[PDB]
Design a protein around this ligand. Structure first.
Ligand code: A1BOJ
Ligand code: ZN
Length: 139
């Protein structure tokens, strides 16, 4: 689990969105595994606006942060789960590293701020849903 809180927005993995998230839906994209909901309290997280390909991610299954190199956001094939059939997930960034299904929502950060959140994993690869292109999160 995990979320990004910026302004009056809460950003979570779409497959983990709650009833309150859907009842206060702002925007969602199944092809990206992203959902943004509105909040009453103000959020103070900083979203990165960059092309970084290095950063650090939180892995709850190891209670550890790992430094990683990751690919630029792209369309990648993702095998079926109880949440989605087999499809291409867009705006996804891959890195070599550990993950478990419960690690979704862990934040990936660079010196500029929040890059994205853990969304996929398999075969020793971990994928992050990018949020750097969502310029509207900052107003
Ligand atoms: C081994 C492993 N690590 C993780 C993070 C996973 C879970 C995973 O990849 N999923 C399941 C939830 C929906 C995801 C999606 N975006 O389509 C796919 N598995
Ligand atoms: Zn950066």
């Amino acid at each position: 689990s995990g979320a990004i809180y910026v302004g009056n927005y809460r950003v979570v993995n779409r497959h983990l969105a709650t009833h309150n998230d859907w009842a206060n839906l702002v925007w969602e994209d199944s092809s990206r595994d992203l959902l943004v909901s509105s909040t009453t309290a103000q959020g103070c997280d900083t979203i990165a606006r960059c092309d970084c390909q290095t950063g650090v991610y939180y892995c709850s299954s190891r209670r550890k942060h790992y430094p990683v190199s990751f690919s630029k956001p792209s369309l990648i094939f993702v095998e079926a789960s109880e949440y989605y059939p087999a499809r291409y997930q867009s705006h996804l960034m891959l890195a070599v590293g550990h993950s478990e299904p419960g690690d979704c929502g862990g934040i990936l950060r660079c010196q500029h701020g929040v890059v994205g959140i853990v969304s996929t994993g398999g075969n020793g690869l971990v994928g992050f849903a990018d949020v750097r292109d969502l310029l509207w999160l900052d107003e």
